[PDB]
Design a binder for this molecule. Structure first.
Ligand SMILES: *C[C@@](*)(O)[C@H](CCCNC(N)=[NH2+])NC(=O)[C@@H]1CCCN1C(=O)[C@H](N)Cc1ccccc1
Ligand SMILES: *[C@@H]1O[C@H](CO)[C@@H](O)[C@H](O)[C@H]1NC(C)=O
Ligand code: NA
Ligand SMILES: [Zn+2]
Ligand SMILES: [Zn+2]
Ligand SMILES: [Zn+2]
Lengths: 40, 243
């Protein structure tokens, strides 16, 4: 980690994973565009 | 957001809306980075020309789902970058707000990740696309639902050549080139909103930028400018690890 959990609060370990998408293994309607932009 | 699309429910759970308390007025976008810290643009809180010099007690933020389980939180304290240059080019357009009481994460409320060295050097490259979200103008002069648009990061040389405003290493620009076909841009008052990228490695979303400035909205040959979050992560640490 980068932040002390005591000042920062909850979150640096539980961040960027959406309950309704990544956590349910569901892709949102346009994130593939971002993925496509990485691939050359 | 101009030329964007409607956002799906729970698509951007770190989305925060900054409101003027009295009278109630939507002022800017913002992002949730933990259960008690919110990131936004400094000019959303401090820009004297626009008569903006807010005290923590003048604002409220709203998080979560757009009239029942939405979350309204008061602010405990506001932190503006000490070297924020509002008189010139908005250099270091970044601010932190600490919530009065931490919020509970839910299906509709969760923090976005802040990038580390390895992440910002693997994903912060020209050509790669990020995502910007907001409730700002749909056209140069408002949506009923949160708007979204994915935009490619533009090489520095092109960004600098697109404007007479002095660009610093604390900013980056994004948007489609006149002939790339697609369009899209953030627009006032999308400022403070996050420019996020999904890492294909750990499947996590990281906030790489903050809507900062632009000339007009979605105009050909021009691009949106964003505060370079990673370059200012040290200040975020000092403030959070300080207090
Ligand atoms: C505060 C935000 O709502 C807004 C975001 C603009 C984003 N625009 C595009 N096309 N992505 N920022 C501003 O309105 C800032 C605040 C100061 C004035 N300003 C501008 O963007 C001016 N139009 C240009 C500018 C003025 C001063 C310094 C730098 C740029
Ligand atoms: C903000 O308002 C406070 C007075 O209440 C003032 O001391 C401070 O100089 C203002 N910040 C400016 C104008 O940059
Ligand atoms: Na443009
Ligand atoms: Zn969680
Ligand atoms: Zn519609
Ligand atoms: Zn003045």
């Amino acid at each position: 980690t980068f932040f002390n959990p005591r000042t920062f609060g909850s979150g640096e370990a539980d961040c960027g994973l959406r309950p309704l998408f990544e956590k349910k293994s569901l892709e949102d309607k346009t994130e593939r565009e971002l993925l496509e932009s990485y691939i050359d | 957001i101009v030329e964007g699309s409607d956002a799906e429910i729970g698509m951007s759970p770190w989305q925060v809306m900054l409101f003027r308390k009295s009278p109630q007025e939507l002022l800017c976008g913002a992002s949730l980075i933990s259960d008690r810290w919110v990131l936004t643009a400094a000019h959303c809180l401090l820009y004297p020309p626009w008569d903006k010099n807010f005290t923590e007690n003048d604002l409220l933020v709203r998080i979560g789902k757009h009239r029942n389980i939405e979350k309204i939180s008061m602010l405990e304290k506001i932190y503006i970058h000490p070297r924020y240059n509002w008189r010139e080019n908005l250099d270091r357009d970044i601010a932190l707000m600490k919530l009065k009481k931490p919020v509970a994460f839910s299906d509709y409320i969760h923090p976005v990740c802040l990038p580390d060295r390895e992440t910002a050097a693997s994903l912060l490259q020209a050509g790669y696309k990020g995502r910007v979200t907001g409730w700002g103008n749909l056209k140069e002069t408002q949506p009923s639902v949160l708007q979204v648009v994915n935009l490619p990061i533009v090489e520095r040389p092109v960004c600098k050549d697109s404007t007479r405003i002095r660009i610093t290493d604390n900013m980056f620009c994004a948007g489609y080139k006149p002939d790339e076909g697609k369009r899209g841009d953030a627009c006032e008052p999308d400022s403070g909103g996050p420019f996020v990228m999904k890492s294909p490695f750990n499947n996590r979303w990281y906030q790489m930028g903050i809507v900062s400035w632009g000339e007009g909205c979605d105009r050909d040959g021009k691009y949106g400018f964003y505060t370079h979050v990673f370059r200012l992560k040290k200040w975020i640490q000092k403030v959070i690890d300080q207090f």
